[PDB]
Design a protein around this ligand. Structure first.
Ligand SMILES: Nc1ncnc2[nH]nc(-c3ccc(Oc4ccccc4)cc3)c12
Length: 265
């Protein structure tokens, strides 16, 4: 819903992200929030604003909430639930010796639940990766920046061969046909699981985007992480079926996750 900046306070700088500067602050006094100032020239504003009202109506505990927006000025402001521990990728790397596999599987339940809610609303992410997931003060993981890639003007960020396109998280049908589906978000979730159990290592770190695309196209798949059990690996590997219809839905995935958690007792 629209927010009068009168009701906001800027308290600290969190840094500049892919879509502009971000700061920590307070909304209506009692709400810790992160206000992002949208880089000018980066977004299709009208389309993004209209879709923002939709992402406002998406609510789930494991999804970084959108509390409102300031659109009658530029740069547009986006007021979101504040995640004290920052990006999940850097959270994974900083506490490399402080995560037990039970906490890792928890982080996977969190992501899978958020993506199952997004699946059930027939809403696509289009860029699921650890760098777009955030962690709050209680170690809980939440998805964010969902559907944001739909509104980027830079063609490098959108085209299959763009220099900034996340090939290493993309399914074969996204690289070859630009066919986005919940199944491509599932492929991406598989890669994300690999990020989690790898404690934040870059998938195919030493591959050019092209080399990755071709290897993926010919059957190469990420190696089982050291901290991943044969059951966890089975789940993230099942996310990477060549045939989209052969990949299990996020609901079936969450169930498998819960089965592994139960067997981890
Ligand atoms: N919410 C944060 N909490 C702590 N640190 C942070 N750094 N950056 C952000 C951030 C802020 C706004 C934002 O817009 C959104 C929000 C939800 C969905 C899509 C887009 C996406 C990310 C952030």
């Amino acid at each position: 819903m629209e927010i009068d900046p009168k009701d906001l306070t800027f308290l600290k700088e969190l840094g500049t992200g892919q879509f502009g500067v971000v700061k920590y602050g307070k909304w209506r006094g009692q709400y810790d929030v992160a206000i992002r100032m949208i880089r000018e020239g980066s977004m299709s504003e009208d389309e993004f604003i209209e879709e923002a009202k939709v992402m406002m109506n998406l609510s789930h505990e494991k999804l970084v909430q959108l509390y409102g927006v300031c659109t009658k000025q530029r740069p547009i402001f986006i007021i979101t639930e504040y995640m004290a521990n920052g990006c999940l990728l850097n959270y994974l790397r900083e506490m490399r010796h402080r995560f037990q596999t039970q906490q890792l599987l928890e982080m996977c339940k969190d992501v899978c639940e958020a993506m199952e809610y997004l699946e059930s609303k027939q809403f696509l992410h289009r860029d699921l990766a650890a760098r777009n997931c955030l962690v709050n003060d209680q170690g809980v993981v939440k998805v964010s920046d969902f559907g944001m890639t739909r509104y980027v003007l830079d063609d490098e960020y959108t085209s299959s061969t763009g220099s900034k396109f996340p090939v290493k998280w993309a399914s074969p049908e996204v690289l070859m046909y630009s066919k986005f589906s919940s199944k491509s978000d599932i492929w991406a979730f598989g890669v994300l699981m690999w990020e989690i159990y790898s404690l934040g290592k870059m998938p195919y770190e030493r591959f050019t985007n092209s080399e990755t695309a071709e290897h993926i196209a010919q059957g190469l798949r990420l190696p089982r992480p050291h901290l991943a059990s044969e059951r966890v690996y089975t789940i993230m590997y099942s996310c990477w079926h060549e045939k989209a219809d052969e990949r299990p839905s996020f609901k079936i995935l969450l169930s498998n996750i819960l089965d592994v958690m139960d067997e981890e007792s």
